[PDB]
Amino acid sequence: PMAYFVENFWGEKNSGFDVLYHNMKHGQISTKELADFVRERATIEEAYSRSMTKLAKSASNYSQLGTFAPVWDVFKTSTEKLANCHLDLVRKLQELIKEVQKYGEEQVKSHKKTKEEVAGTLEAVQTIQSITQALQKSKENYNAKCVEQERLKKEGATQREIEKAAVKSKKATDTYKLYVEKYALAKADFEQKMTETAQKFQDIEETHLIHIKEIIGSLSNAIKEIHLQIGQVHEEFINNMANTTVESLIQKFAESKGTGKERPGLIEFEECD
Amino acid sequence: MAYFVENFWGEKNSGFDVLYHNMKHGQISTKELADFVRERATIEEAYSRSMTKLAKSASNYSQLGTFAPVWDVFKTSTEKLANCHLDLVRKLQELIKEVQKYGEEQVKSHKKTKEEVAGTLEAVQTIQSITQALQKSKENYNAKCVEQERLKKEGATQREIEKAAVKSKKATDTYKLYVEKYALAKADFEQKMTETAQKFQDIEETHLIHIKEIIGSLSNAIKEIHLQIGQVHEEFINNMANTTVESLIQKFAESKGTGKERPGLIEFEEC
Structure with missing residues (x-):
């Protein structure tokens, strides 16, 4: 609740207003840099998703020979589901990038209005100087x-x-x-205007940092949501492996690749006819 | 039960030839398991090395703005995430080792089994x-x-x-x-085949239980790292909560502040 901007932005040069104003403008940089960070995280998530999809394809193209052969379908379905989880995170991050970009362009609007509102403090600075x-x-x-x-x-x-x-x-x-x-x-006018404006900038900066942390909040929420889904894919795979028992694997191999049930017949002495 | 005994006879008596070659196909299943874990490790390492690169890029953003210090939170968390995935890579590389160690000792027991039931092979050649x-x-x-x-x-x-x-x-x-x-010869074939088909099922049982134990170890390694990944996500959320709006406002004000002291009093001074 303390007025850090009021207490710390004076000095002999009367340049405090300039610093604060341009610091507000640097708040545009942070928005661009954050979107760029989320874009690169989405890139990594999509690379992982596409490689996992390819891993499922290679799982479906394994040899059909052997008793273990039907298990690869459990590997296929789970890997397909895991790959889909990461691609959905990509989609969620891309929606997040869109609202960061939206915040970036409504920053430009609110920075323009602040400029027009602090015009009296700009005069107070240049007159005292x-x-x-x-x-x-x-x-x-x-x-x-x-x-x-x-x-x-x-x-x-x-x-x-x-x-x-x-x-x-x-x-x-x-x-x-x-x-x-x-x-x-001019000193009395500057001090009255600067105290009102230094606080103004701090309030703008607090609104800025609150909205930014909310975006990082939504970032953490999308990652957590997909993380929960990923854990459910792993657990589904575990019990699908438990359900795929040795008994059933031998059962299915004998039924499909069995040569014959009936043993060779008994042949006796035959008459000439 | 005994599915191998009951369902592997037929007129041409291909039973032995089919069951022996199926045992040999158990080696293929082991190779394909190694190829799967290796490919999964490749994906997990690429991801890890990309995350490490993302973590380091987090520190090379602009010094300007009140938000600037928040980048270190990204840097430390993204580093930890990257290390979790590399730790899984190392664990999967330990599995490839025991899979191929199981694969090479399969060759040993398979050749032993061949020599153990060569008489049943003769019995098929005899009756034919x-x-x-x-x-x-x-x-x-x-x-x-x-x-x-x-x-x-x-x-x-x-x-x-x-x-x-x-x-x-x-x-x-x-x-x-x-x-x-x-x-x-019929009383010799049917007697030996019943013992051999049961032996082929018993060794296939020991094969399938051990392969599932390795896949169990695979699921455990992924589950363990998945738990660690979830902890990093919670540590990131906490560190973001600790980095308060107030602490950033104070950080910038004391770093880039132009002065604590207000404009001085200037009065008349006589020469």
């Missing part, structure tokens, strides 16, 4: 008339030409005195 | 040699009786009858001997 430089110029000019006043005074000059040098110091004093009052006015 | 010779003598003895009938219907000499009778007598003596030798 201008007056601080103008005050320094009037400070140095005031001192330049002091040195020239005392240069002519200590060396020896007419009281008429000293008095007109004193008036040149008076106008140098008055304008410097006026800039001191102008600084205090 | 005899039944053909029994049919040869059956056709012969009947032809001697056809000649006995042919020469009687036409009429011949009494001494030719003695010659045809003694030829039919020896045709009977051999044909009757082949009937006894068939019944002796």
Whole structure:
């Protein structure tokens, strides 16, 4: 709840506004980088899915010879289901990329509106920066008339030409005195505007980081959901292997590849006929 | 029960030849199991090395933005995921070793079994040699009786009858001997085949139970890593919860803050 942005963005240069504003704009970078990360994760998931699909094809094309042969269909169906799980994660990640891209383009809208809203604080910054430089110029000019006043005074000059040098110091004093009052006015305006705007930026940054973590939340949800499905494919495979018993494998081999039930007949002595 | 004994006889008696070659096909099932685990490990390693590459790319994103520190959470979690899949690769490579060790010791027991029931192979060669010779003598003895009938219907000499009778007598003596030798070989084949077909089923039982034990070890290895993968997903969720909005706001403000102190007070200063 603490105002970190208000407390930490002042300094002598009055550049805090600039930093904060461009930091808001850098929030666009993060959205592009996140989408790119999810795209690459989806690439890996699809590579895995396509290879698993190919692994199921090779499982169906194994030799039909032997008692174990029918078990490859249990390998086929499970590998097909596992491959489909990963492809569905790809689809879910791709839907997630779409809503990151959607957030990225509504950032551009809300950044444009913030720019138009902080226009008063932009003025407050450039006026205080201008007056601080103008005050320094009037400070140095005031001192330049002091040195020239005392240069002519200590060396020896007419009281008429000293008095007109004193008036040149008076106008140098008055304008410097006026800039001191102008600084205090611009300083009070800047501090009032910056405190409202530094908080404004922090609030924008909090809304940003909340929405981003919600996307990573949906990222974690899709991965967890598919992870649960993957675990169910493994368990289905386990008990399908349990159901495929040795008894049934021998049963099916004898019934299909058995030569004959009836044993060779008994032949006796035959008459000539 | 006994399916191999009951259902492997037939007229041509291919029973032994089929069951022996089927035992040999048990070696193919072992090779194809190795090829499956190897291909699965290849997929699991490619995935792992891609994830490692993804984990390292997570750190090479922009330093700009309040979100920046969150990338380390991605980096550490994606690294751990990558290592889980490589650990499975190592476990699957240990299975390929025991499958091929089982495959090479199958060759040892199969050649032993061949030498154990070579007598039953002889019994198949014996009954086939005899039944053909029994049919040869059956056709012969009947032809001697056809000649006995042919020469009687036409009429011949009494001494030719003695010659045809003694030829039919020896045709009977051999044909009757082949009937006894068939019944002796049938009682030898059916006795040995029943013992051999039961032996072929018993060794096929020990084959199928051991192959299922290896696939059991396969399912265990995948289940164990799947549990670890689920823990990484939960650790990622936790680390994301720990990386609060407040901690990121504080991170950036103290890193890229322009100054704690507000613009200074400037008053008149006399020369």
